[PDB]
Amino acid sequence: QCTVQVRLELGHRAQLRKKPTTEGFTHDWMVFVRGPEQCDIQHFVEKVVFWLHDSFPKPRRVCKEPPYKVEESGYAGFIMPIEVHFKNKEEPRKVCFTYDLFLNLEGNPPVNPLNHLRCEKLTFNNPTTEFRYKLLRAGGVMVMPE
Amino acid sequence: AARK
Structure with a gap:
């Protein structure tokens, strides 16, 4: 009867530090989930959970409100x-992504920041009328059913 | 690259 598609952007920035930290962290990075363009995904997103490597303290990081992001050094x-x-x-x-947080991109001088974007399209089949409205408020569109 |  109804199919709603909406877009999410997952991405990260990484850059070599001008000096490593006392712990030996050589890079600063930030990972995020966001709407495209003007789109406000808070209409349909309750929270985003980022599962960091267990070398990081309290590695289950939760953002219940924008911005959905984690900023760390490593x-x-x-x-x-x-x-x-x-x-x-x-x-x-929910939707589960597995994000490749990489600190080096071949072709990029390490002193220069790297930026990566992943555009993910989500498809919802026969959503509730409430959820359909939240999806459309966030830039979603209805397409050919199924 | 350095990965863990």
């Missing part, structure tokens, strides 16, 4: 599970 890239939880009461209650 010495190596790692795989970061990210959960985007929705303001809905039916499945899917």
Whole structure:
């Protein structure tokens, strides 16, 4: 009957520090989840959970409000599970991403910042009328059902 | 690259 698609942007910035920290952290980085352009995903996003590498203290980082982001320093890239939880009461209650937080991009001088963007399109089949309105308030659109 |  109804299919709603909405877009999320997942990304990160990393840059070599001008001097490593006392712990040996060589890079500063920031990972985020956000709407495209003008789109406010807080209409349908309850919270975003970033699962950091267990070298980091309290590695389950939660943002219940924008900005959905984590900013840290470190010495190596790692795989970061990210959960985007929705303001809905039916499945899917969340979407699980596995984000590659890398500190080096070949072709980029390490002194220069790196920026990576991942554009993810979410598809919701037969959402509740409430959730449909939240999705559309966040830039979602209805498309050919299924 | 350095990965963990």
